[model samples]
Target: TKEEAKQAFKELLKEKRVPSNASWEQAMKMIINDPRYSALAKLS
Candidate 1:
């Protein structure tokens, strides 16, 4: 689902860029929730 992937990427960017109240666990979970589609996928 590219749509799902696209939406997930949105959240990743938001947290990565601003964090705004981000947490270690929040970022971790955001990443692991859908690794394949994550903006952080490039981390690999």
Candidate 2:
């Protein structure tokens, strides 16, 4: 489930077009409200 969640989360980032060099905090903020984000919320 962790690997699946990670993949989904990355796909979400790609869908959101988050910059490759963006900070984790910034990216997290961008996707915080997304349902997929809920699955990986506890990840670093």
Candidate 3:
């Protein structure tokens, strides 16, 4: 689900201790090629 994707991303961010000052684009780059990250099509 799209909801869980962000949850995973959120957990990933915490795991990485991503800085609050970082942009979304910067954070997304970490998982841009992740299998789960590109699972949006599965939601359909």
Candidate 4:
């Protein structure tokens, strides 16, 4: 569920579906910089 949510979030960002204030860099930081993201691959 988390992975799917992450993908959807990314798509929203890539397609500019979110509000104008959305930041791609912030999304990336959530994906790569967050400790939970590091556990994603391990869980899968």
Candidate 5:
């Protein structure tokens, strides 16, 4: 689901301690495009 994906992205952003300016869409794109965080899907 789109919402799940967005949630996952938000989680990732938080885990990475990324700036708030990093929108959910941006995080989603990174999660999908970047291989660095393929294993960790959710924010912890």
Candidate 6:
């Protein structure tokens, strides 16, 4: 389910219109704050 969770995070990132240039750390931080994506923050 980790892959699904990661995919979901990517989908949400697109949905939220996050910049493509956003770094992984930046994305992770953003994910941490997003209720829909927060679960992925703990992933990896």
Q: Count the clashes in each prediction.
A: 0, 0, 0, 0, 1, 0
lDDT per residue as tens, model 4, 2-27 = 88867865674565443458576766
Report lDDT per candidate: 0.64, 0.76, 0.69, 0.61, 0.66, 0.67
Candidate 6 worst ten-residue window by lDDT: 35-44
Collision count of model 1? 0
* lDDT: the better of candidates 2 and 6: 2
Q: Candidate 1: where are CA atoms >4 Å away?
A: 1-20, 37-44
What TM-score, over all chains together, does every model reach?
0.35, 0.53, 0.41, 0.35, 0.40, 0.45
Best by TM-score: 2
Give the runs in model 4 whose Cα sits over 4 Å from its true position: 17-44
Tell me the tens digit of each residue's lDDT in model 5 across 1-44.
Answer: 57986797667666764468878677667667667565555644
lDDT of 6 by residue, 1-44 (tens): 56886687668777765677877788767767766444445554
Top lDDT hit: 2
Q: Which stretches of candidate 2 lie above 4 Å from their native place?
A: 20-22, 35-44
For model 6, the stretches where C-alpha displacement exceeds 4 angstroms are 1-3, 37-44
**TM-score quality measure for candidate 3:** 0.41
Q: What is the C-alpha RMSD of each candidate to the true structure, in Å?
A: 7.5, 4.6, 3.3, 6.1, 6.6, 4.1
Give me the overall lDDT of model 3.
0.69
User: Model 4 shows how many backbone clashes?
Assistant: 0
Ordered list by lDDT, greatest first: 2, 3, 6, 5, 1, 4
